[PDB]
């Protein structure tokens, strides 16, 4: 239980990824659907509006999933690199009662990239049983830029 | 490693057209927006429009949209921007630049057009004379003439002006030096070919 | 929108703190504002973008802040390389604009300026133009009025002015002024002299 759940596929269509917002600038345009794993061409990768600690990417599997762990992955424009460091994991059933993920006691702080294309593996110990999932970028270099994909399994 | 290279300086006369190019180098211009921007001799930077050589989409600014044509090479990954209809006051040197990822990051060269009813030709040059003694660059177009002094063994002290253009249309510039010993100015003035070391 | 910068120009010295500033005419997202650097026969380098990220490269020295119709660059402690001019803009989807830009020079000390004048050369006569000079050298602040008298009549009009680039080491400016004249005109008079006036301080002249 450690598959790829269709960021990078398309398995997840682009109608089911969403975001707190987006960057968008003359002929480009950092949506969210922009957010996969591997993904190359202008502008190849979600980027909120602003960057600040309260935006985030969603992903909506459209049904309950067992997820494993989350990849990441900066970007590169010409020569500037941009990429999250740390980030938080919430989840939800309905898209609206959200749980932050937690280790010990704590909020959860997944330490992500370090450069623009190297992609980052974290495992979620326990693993959750989700419809939605939720990355919420803490620390970045430059810009918030995200490129990922979702491990697990089918929950039937 | 990237770089973008722009053609080479440019003198039109009024009612003419000029075409510069922006050669891009480290990567497809395709994946990238150019921006066009000019700076008039003592002005600022002013926006003159932007295209998208992978739609060949482009949007201009207020004041250039009926003077302006963007269009772009994508084999041979060269920006084009074809000023017409050029004035006098189109004079300046105009850039091309790409964002990285946001705004005007990566710059070109730039590429100086001049536009007058004046033709290109070399400037005489007088002899002027702590003392002070120098030399009278006048009657040239277009810019730029460089100037040095014992061939570049002198540069304490020396203070060489900005051109400055006469009713006539030409240009005049001079160069002087504070300080037995001989003193000579190097003139050069590319455009026409002209070069000349004036004993003062 | 249109973006306005202040000051016109700045001076201040080494190892001071720097602030400028652009107003704009409405207010919009922090991530679309640029600040430049630009140094004589340079093309300009982008410092800051989305108003507080610094471009690779450039020293934490820079750094930038603000939103909505405010927008600030910040120079920590100024180094003689930080003199130059300073252009914010707007980028965006659908168009981009700059402000008219400041020019940050260094505070040096009031020093008026040696002043020195130079008749036409013989060389140019026989072209049949006459071109006087004037210079003052090494002087500062920039500001400095120049008044030609031929046989004591005020010139105005006829004559060209040009400033050299702040120099970096005394911090002062050098300015020439040329006044141009026909050979005909030109001998049809005998004194020719340059009035100086700056707040250090002058007339230098000579007989046709």
């Given at each position: 239980c450690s598959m790829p759940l269709g960021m990078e596929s398309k398995?997840?269509?682009?109608?089911?990824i969403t975001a707190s917002s987006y960057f968008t600038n003359m002929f480009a345009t950092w949506s969210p659907?922009?957010?996969?794993?591997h993904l190359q061409g202008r502008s190849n990768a979600w980027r909120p509006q602003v960057n600040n600690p309260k935006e985030w990417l969603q992903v909506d599997f459209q049904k309950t999933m067992k997820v494993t762990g989350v990849t990441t992955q900066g970007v590169k424009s010409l020569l500037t690199s941009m990429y999250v460091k740390e980030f938080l994991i919430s989840s939800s059933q309905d898209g609206h009662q959200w749980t932050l993920f937690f280790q010990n006691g704590k909020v959860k702080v997944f330490q992500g990239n370090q450069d623009s294309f190297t992609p980052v593996v974290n495992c979620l110990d326990p693993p959750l049983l989700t419809r939605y999932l939720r990355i919420h970028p803490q620390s970045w270099v430059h810009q918030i830029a995200l490129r990922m994909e979702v491990l697990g399994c089918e929950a039937q | 490693q990237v770089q973008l290279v722009q053609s080479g300086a440019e003198v039109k006369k009024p009612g003419a057209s000029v075409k510069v190019s922006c050669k891009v180098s480290?990567?497809?211009?395709?994946e990238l927006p150019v921006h066009w921007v000019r700076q008039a001799p003592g002005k600022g930077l002013e926006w003159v429009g932007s295209f998208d050589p992978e739609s060949g989409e482009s949007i201009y600014a207020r004041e250039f949209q009926g003077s302006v044509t963007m269009t772009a090479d994508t084999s041979t990954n060269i920006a084009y921007m074809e000023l017409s209809?050029?004035?006098?006051?189109?004079t300046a040197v105009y850039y091309c630049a790409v964002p990285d990822?946001?705004?005007?990051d990566i710059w070109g060269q730039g590429t100086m057009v001049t536009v007058s009813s004046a033709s290109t030709k070399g400037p005489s040059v007088f002899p002027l004379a702590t003392a002070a003694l120098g030399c009278l660059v006048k009657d040239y177009f277009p810019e730029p003439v460089t100037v040095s002094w014992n061939s570049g063994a002198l540069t304490s002290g020396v203070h060489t002006f900005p051109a400055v253009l006469q009713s006539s249309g030409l240009y005049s510039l001079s160069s002087v030096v504070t300080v037995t010993a001989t003193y000579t100015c190097n003139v050069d003035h590319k455009p026409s070919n002209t070069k000349v070391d004036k004993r003062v | 929108i249109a973006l306005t910068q202040s000051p016109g120009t700045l001076s201040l010295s080494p190892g001071e703190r720097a602030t400028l500033s652009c107003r704009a005419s409405q207010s919009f997202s922090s991530s679309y504002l640029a600040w430049y650097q630009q140094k004589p026969g340079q093309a300009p380098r982008l410092?800051?973008?989305?108003?507080?990220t610094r471009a690779t490269?450039?020293?934490?020295?820079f750094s930038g802040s603000g939103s909505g119709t405010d927008f600030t660059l910040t120079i920590s402690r100024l180094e003689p390389e930080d003199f130059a001019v300073y252009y914010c803009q707007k980028y965006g989807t659908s168009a981009i604009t700059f402000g008219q830009g400041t020019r940050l020079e260094i505070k040096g000390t009031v020093a008026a300026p040696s002043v020195f004048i130079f008749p036409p050369s013989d060389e140019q006569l026989k072209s049949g133009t006459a071109s006087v000079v004037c210079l003052l050298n090494?002087?500062?602040?920039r500001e400095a009025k120049v008044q030609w008298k031929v046989d004591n009549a005020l010139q105005s009009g006829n004559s060209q002015e040009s400033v050299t680039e702040q120099?970096?080491?005394?911090s002062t400016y050098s300015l020439s002024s040329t006044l141009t004249l026909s050979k005909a005109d030109y001998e049809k008079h005998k004194v020719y002299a340059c009035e100086v006036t700056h707040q250090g301080l002058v007339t230098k002249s000579f007989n046709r």
């Open positions: 398995a997840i269509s682009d109608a089911q659907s922009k957010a996969r794993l | 480290g990567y497809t211009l395709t209809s050029l004035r006098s006051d189109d990822p946001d705004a005007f | 410092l800051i973008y989305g108003a507080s490269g450039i020293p934490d020295r090494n002087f500062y602040p120099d970096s080491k005394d």
